[PDB]
């Protein structure tokens, strides 16, 4: 429901983006070419003109799965078997060149590149595709490792998972929900900056709360970390309301903030929630998703040079469609930045 208004606006922005670009739709690689949930989601995704899907796998292995489920319009969609691809040898040498001083010999560089996750990441890095969506079948750290060492982070960026909580008026952004165990104050500032750019993309004023178990205490440990993170972010972005350390209800509820901490620079409630450690971010978004009545979409991987998202291992068919939509949007956004 609230997804459906939010995702439909996102789907429209993908269409506005393809149009005024000749009608080019982003090429997205799916390493799990035989995944039932990926293929069923792709039925929706070509119907809706979101992307050209490129599936990885043994072609007949893939096609006979499609006809078993008989979802018709994946009729002609691209299928690539990594080690049969003409660029396989060039991909192997590039991964070897990247990793030969990280304990990776030519044979394992060959074995890694035959794995669809590495092949997909190299395809995106080398411009054979605009994005990838992986991790339907494997755990997050394994799915994200090929992405970080092949595609990597942009300058001063930090890889950080991000989730949207979709409310009646507003949405909230939560980060970092998937990658960093215990980010420093500097890293928390960088995660907040990345989260704010995403909020701005939707034409919304980002209002950033650095979360703690404390309200404006600044005591040793995380209160001080989250207080310092707010300060660093404010110096790197003096136009944004950024505040901390504060408790979560203090952060989201504007009447709580005004009544208890009127000196605070964050008014109107936070829509960006930065967490102090992975336990808190990862448990929070999952508890909201399971017991709250709010739809949470994501996680989405911020901080990487090209568009690449890891599906949470628990996702539904609706999740995958949402994730591809935002992978397409990100690929289009990255493709316009790259020219100017």
How far apart, in whole angstroms, are the C-alpha atoms of residue 290 and residue 285? 9
Contact of 301 with 310, CB cutoff 8 Å = yes
Quote the least distance from Cβ 140 to its own copies, whole Å.
9
Contact of 163 with 198, CB cutoff 8 Å = no
The two beta strands, 78-80 and 52-56, are: parallel
Q: Which residue has the tokens 């960006």?
A: 272
Longest dimension (CA), the chain: 65
**Pick 202 or 261: Cβ nearer its own copies:** 261
Strands (E) located in the chain: 27-30, 52-56, 78-80, 131-134, 160-166, 171-175, 207-211, 241-246, 272-274, 295-302, 307-310
**Pick 59 or 292: Cβ nearer its own copies:** 292
Quote the least distance from Cβ 169 to its own copies, whole Å.
10
Quote the least distance from Cβ 279 to its own copies, whole Å.
4
Nearest to 330 by CA among 172, 189, 143, 124: 124
Quote the least distance from Cβ 310 to its own copies, whole Å.
14
Quote the least distance from Cβ 137 to its own copies, whole Å.
5
**Pick 138 or 153: Cβ nearer its own copies:** 138
Quickly list DSSP for 105-129.
-HHHHHHHHHSHHHHHHHHHHTTS-
Query: Site residues (CB under 8 A) for its own copies?
Result: 97, 100-103, 105, 107-108, 137-139, 142, 165, 167, 172, 181, 211-219, 221-222, 227, 247-250, 252-253, 256, 260-261, 263, 273, 275-284, 286-294, 312-314
Quote the least distance from Cβ 216 to its own copies, whole Å.
5
Provide the 8-state DSSP code for 153: B
**Pick 126 or 253: Cβ nearer its own copies:** 253
**Pick 290 or 340: Cβ nearer its own copies:** 290
**Pick 276 or 303: Cβ nearer its own copies:** 276
């Amino acid at each position: 429901s609230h997804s459906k208004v939010f995702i439909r606006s996102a789907i429209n922005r993908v269409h506005q983006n393809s149009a005024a670009n000749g009608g080019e739709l982003p090429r997205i690689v799916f390493p799990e070419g035989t995944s039932t949930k990926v293929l069923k989601a792709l039925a929706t995704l070509v119907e809706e003109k979101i992307c050209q899907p490129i599936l990885l796998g043994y072609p007949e292995r893939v096609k006979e799965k499609i006809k078993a489920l008989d979802i018709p319009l994946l009729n002609d969609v691209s299928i690539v078997h990594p080690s049969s691809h003409p660029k396989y040898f060039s991909f192997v040498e590039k991964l070897y060149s990247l990793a030969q001083r990280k304990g990776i010999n030519l044979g394992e560089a060959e074995r890694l590149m035959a794995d669809p996750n590495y092949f997909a990441a190299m395809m995106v890095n080398q411009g054979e595709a605009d994005g990838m969506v992986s991790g339907s079948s494997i755990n997050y750290a394994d799915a994200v490792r090929p992405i970080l060492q092949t595609i990597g982070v942009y300058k001063e960026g930090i890889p950080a998972g991000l989730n949207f909580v979709l409310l009646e008026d507003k949405f909230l952004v939560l980060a970092d929900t998937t990658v960093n165990l215990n980010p420093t104050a500097e890293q928390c500032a960088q995660i907040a900056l990345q989260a704010a750019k995403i909020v701005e993309y939707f034409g919304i004023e980002p209002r950033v709360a650095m979360l703690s178990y404390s309200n404006f205490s600044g005591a040793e440990g995380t209160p001080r970390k989250m207080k310092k993170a707010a300060e660093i972010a404010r110096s790197l972005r003096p136009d944004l309301m950024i505040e901390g350390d504060m408790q979560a209800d203090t952060a989201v509820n504007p009447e709580i903030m005004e009544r208890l901490f009127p000196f605070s620079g964050l008014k109107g409630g936070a829509n960006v929630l930065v967490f102090p450690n992975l336990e808190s971010s990862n448990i929070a978004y999952k508890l909201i998703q399971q017991i709250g009545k709010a739809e949470v979409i994501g996680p989405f991987l911020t901080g990487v040079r090209r568009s690449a998202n890891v599906l949470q291992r628990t996702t539904t068919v609706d999740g995958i469609v949402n994730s591809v939509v935002f992978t397409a949007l990100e690929a289009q956004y990255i493709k316009e930045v790259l020219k100017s």
